[PDB]
């Protein structure tokens, strides 16, 4: 149940939420902060309740954001679903299925980050912690995804005893039990997770971006190949003087998702952007597919939404590409066509 005004209020919340989903999380606060009830559970109940009428790419894009209060909905919404007496296979299928999962490494990474804290509360007798299930997790997504394509040779696919030797010293500096993982292989084999992601994600995207089809993803990659640092080789911003930044990932999730990090870019009109860029990488086909990526966004800072002069910075460096843009997708703050008419101007 919720209160008789979260009750009224649903239609309008998801005709707002779907539209723009800032303002339909605006107006679940507002109503929360004038009837004195807490705003993460009623926002982490929402998205389940009313999971069959809303842009699913939007709330799955809120509950894997990096902010406070997303990090506190996520937490609520994962603690909401019960994993007691669930297999550890049958969790991680049922949580992931619940999503349009997003194509954004940090973003997939704290959703499963939230599963495997919640299956290790729930369950601290079949995992013994939850890095451990974290490990377990991101293994079970790429291997299922594998067995299940029917087009990957059979002589490739790892194999019960293959999966034993792949999980050595995996399990709290440990193993994890032989049984314990033949019944995880036989769950992964049984069933394909047919996991649905986002086709593109918020800002701009340029799928199949290389350094022989592009020359400024020839010089940034250069860069970040031999280790050197990014200089301004941006042809829109060559009258800008620019500090450019390399944020590194951590090296497990850029194996399994291929980011290889992001470059953060400010200008001196305070404008500031980041530079996600994706190359195929050892665990990542699932994740990525056989071809690089690069996603641009203006960046939000200290909570608050970027600015014009940020939204102008990424059209700029979005179009500094050789490569048109793939896709143009609404950011929390802001609508497609903000995106669209900058990069349309500047391009």
Same mark, same amino acid.
């Given at each position: ?74 937490? &609520? ?23 349009? @999962? ?27 912690? &939850?890095?451990?299930?974290? @490990? ?74 290389? =350094? ?40 497990? @999730?850029?194996?399994? !998702?291929?980011?290889?990090? =992001? ?20 665990? =990542? ?6 071809? =690089? ?20 910075? &990424?059209?700029?460096? !979005? ?29």
């Amino acid at each position: 149940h919720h209160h008789p005004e979260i009750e009224k209020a649903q239609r309008e919340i998801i005709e707002a939420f779907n539209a723009k989903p800032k303002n339909g999380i605006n107006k679940i606060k507002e109503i929360c902060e004038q009837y004195k009830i807490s705003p993460n559970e009623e926002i982490a109940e929402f998205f389940h309740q009313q999971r069959k009428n809303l842009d699913l790419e939007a709330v799955g894009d809120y509950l894997s954001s990096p902010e406070a209060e997303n990090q506190q909905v996520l937490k &609520a919404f994962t603690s909401q679903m019960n994993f007691n007496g669930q297999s550890f296979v049958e969790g991680l299928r049922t949580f992931l299925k619940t999503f349009k @999962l997003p194509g954004e490494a940090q973003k997939i990474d704290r959703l499963v980050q939230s599963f495997s804290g919640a299956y290790f509360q729930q369950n601290p007798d079949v995992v013994s912690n &939850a890095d451990a299930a974290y @490990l377990l997790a991101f293994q079970t997504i790429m291997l299922n995804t594998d067995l299940h394509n029917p087009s990957i040779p059979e002589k490739n696919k790892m194999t019960v005893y293959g999966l034993k030797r792949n999980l050595r010293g995996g399990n709290n500096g440990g193993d994890f039990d032989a049984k314990f993982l033949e019944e995880l292989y036989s769950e992964i084999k049984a069933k394909p997770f047919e996991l649905n992601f986002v086709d593109s994600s918020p800002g701009y995207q340029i799928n199949n971006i290389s =350094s022989q089809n592009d020359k400024t993803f020839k010089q940034l990659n250069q860069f970040l190949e031999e280790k050197r640092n990014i200089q301004n080789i941006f042809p829109k911003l060559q009258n800008n003087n620019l500090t450019i930044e390399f944020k590194n990932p951590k090296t497990f @999730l850029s194996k399994f !998702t291929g980011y290889k990090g =992001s470059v953060i870019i400010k200008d001196e009109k305070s404008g500031a952007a980041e530079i996600q860029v994706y190359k195929p990488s050892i665990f =990542s086909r699932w994740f990525l597919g056989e071809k =690089s990526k690069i996603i641009i966004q203006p960046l939000r800072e200290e909570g608050r939404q970027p600015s014009e002069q940020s939204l102008k910075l &990424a059209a700029q460096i !979005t179009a500094s590409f050789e490569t048109k843009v793939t896709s143009i997708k609404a950011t929390y703050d802001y609508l497609k066509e903000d995106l669209k008419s900058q990069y349309d101007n500047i391009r």
